[PDB]
Amino acid sequence: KLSEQGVLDKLKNKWWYDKGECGAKDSGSKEKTSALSLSNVAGVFYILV
């Protein structure tokens, strides 16, 4: 009876996801853009020397 009323699904959604420290939208919301580092373009220096 509890499985057909969705009460077993409502309890699993509460303890697993609502008590979760990081949500799906938590890590998704943080974006940033970074400058290019030397390790990206380091191979062109190795060809040059």
Add this chain to the structure above:
Amino acid sequence: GSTKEFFRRSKIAVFDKMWTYMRSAEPSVFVRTTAEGVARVRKSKGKYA
């Protein structure tokens, strides 16, 4: 106050999700008085509403 009791007994799906976040949040987003609430907005550098 009546502001907190509005989100508690609400059944709108937008307002149900907002009360779920404010229930399970550490540290406490709730403030004691109005003057403390305006004080947090000015000093949190755009992170508190």
